Amino acid sequence: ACYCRIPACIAGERRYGTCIYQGRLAAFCC
Structure with a gap:
């Protein structure tokens, strides 16, 4: 699964993009 996160991705995830x-x-x- 992927997640729109604030303020940042959590350890074990990487940022693949941006949500609004x-x-x-x-x-x-993700």
């Missing part, structure tokens, strides 16, 4: 979810930016992490 209600005026807020997120890291896309």
